Design a binder for this molecule. Structure first.
Ligand SMILES: OC[C@H]1O[C@@H](O[C@H]2[C@H](O)[C@@H](O)[C@H](O[C@@H]3[C@@H](O)[C@@H](O)O[C@H](CO)[C@H]3O)O[C@@H]2CO)[C@H](O)[C@@H](O)[C@@H]1O
Ligand SMILES: OC[C@H]1O[C@@H](O[C@H]2[C@H](O)[C@@H](O)[C@H](O[C@@H]3[C@@H](O)[C@H](O)O[C@H](CO)[C@H]3O)O[C@@H]2CO)[C@H](O)[C@@H](O)[C@@H]1O
Length: 298
């Protein structure tokens, strides 16, 4: 009745076995060096921490080569429709120079498969930004969510929007991302994909509904989502195909690197790359700590 489990990602090596580790140059052109599973384990970038799954970055060595070492995991399995529930004890902090993201990417050529940014932000951001990226012909309505809509056109080249800004909604809770999120011991992000739209709920630690982690969660009875992407201005079924889950932490690049000098991180260094390269200790908080990752289907 409602939803049923299709995949419990487990923890540790069993969890890592369900992902492919991306090691190519960063598609978002950041100052990052994505390493293999073996190199990551050898550098302490991945592992298990008291039953929870850890994924972080190099906060020890001055960077060299492509950039600061990190990992990008992309799930082996993909999902058409469903409910993605992640319980995090910790997420990458609001650290200057960083650009963490837990998101989904459709199959096929970009951007026809669509993409969903569930948890994403840059540098010293306070609020989480939930965003969709699609081909042309997809805009969203203004109701059904607690967050504040920033952009309404999901097309990667929407007319007056920055390139690939997509259609984003900003959370109103300062504990929805980074520093605040970690200070309260994290929380739960549930993402629902249907042929009529996408919804994302953020439940700060201890405020989650009693069935969110169980066998049959029912979003219909949950409080208002933080972000809802729906409306007749988009063919929801056609704009998104099978999605794979992705975890990553990049540095500088297209977004973080370009807004480095405009925000509160500007005074830290002349530029993002210099900061990330010479201040390894600043990235200790840039890690994911997963309590559980479960995917359900209608
Ligand atoms: O166009 C050249 C490459 O595109 C790759 O697709 C990328 C896309 O280019 C990139 O902008 C996008 O970045 C993601 C954001 O859209 C959003 O979803 O947030 C993500 C997390 O921060 C961010 O990475 O990612 C797309 C998928 O990697 C093609 O994959 C690549 O083959 C092609 O050369
Ligand atoms: O290209 C040089 C030019 O960059 C401007 O900064 C842009 C950057 O180029 C864009 O790629 C970036 O876009 C972000 C998206 O990639 C992201 O997915 O979503 C965010 C959120 O709304 C987008 O901002 O935006 C920045 C800032 O507009 C510099 O401003 C400009 O001076 C420089 O010449």
């Amino acid at each position: 009745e409602f939803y049923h489990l299709v995949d419990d990602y487990g923890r540790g090596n069993g969890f890592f076995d369900k992902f492919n580790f991306f090691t190519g140059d960063d598609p978002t052109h950041g100052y990052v060096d994505y390493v293999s599973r073996d190199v990551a384990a050898g550098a302490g970038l991945i592992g298990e921490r008291d039953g929870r799954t850890y994924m972080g970055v190099d906060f020890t060595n001055p960077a060299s080569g492509r950039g600061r070492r990190s990992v990008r995991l992309e799930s082996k399995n993909t999902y058409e429709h469903g409910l993605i529930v992640i319980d995090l004890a910790h997420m990458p902090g609001s650290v200057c120079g960083t650009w963490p993201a837990f998101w989904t990417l459709g199959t096929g050529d970009w951007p026809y498969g669509g993409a969903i940014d569930i948890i994403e932000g840059v540098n010293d951001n306070t609020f989480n930004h939930m965003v969709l990226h699609t081909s042309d012909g997809c805009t969203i309505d203004n109701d059904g969510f607690t967050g504040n809509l920033k952009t309404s056109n999901c097309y990667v080249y929407a007319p007056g929007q920055d390139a690939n800004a997509g259609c984003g909604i900003e959370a109103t809770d300062p504990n929805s991302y980074g520093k605040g999120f970690n200070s309260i011991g994290g929380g739960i992000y549930a993402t629902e994909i249907t042929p009529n739209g996408i919804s994302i709920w953020f439940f700060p630690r201890g405020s989650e509904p009693g069935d969110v982690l169980g066998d049959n969660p029912n979003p219909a009875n949950w409080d208002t989502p933080a972000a809802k992407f729906a409306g007749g201005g988009c063919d929801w079924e056609g704009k998104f195909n099978a999605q794979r889950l992705i975890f990553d932490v990049t540095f500088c690049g297209d977004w973080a690197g370009n807004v480095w000098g405009i925000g509160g991180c500007a005074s830290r260094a002349a530029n993002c790359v210099d900061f990330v390269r010479d201040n390894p200790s600043a990235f200790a908080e840039s890690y994911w700590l997963v309590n559980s990752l479960r995917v359900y289907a209608p």
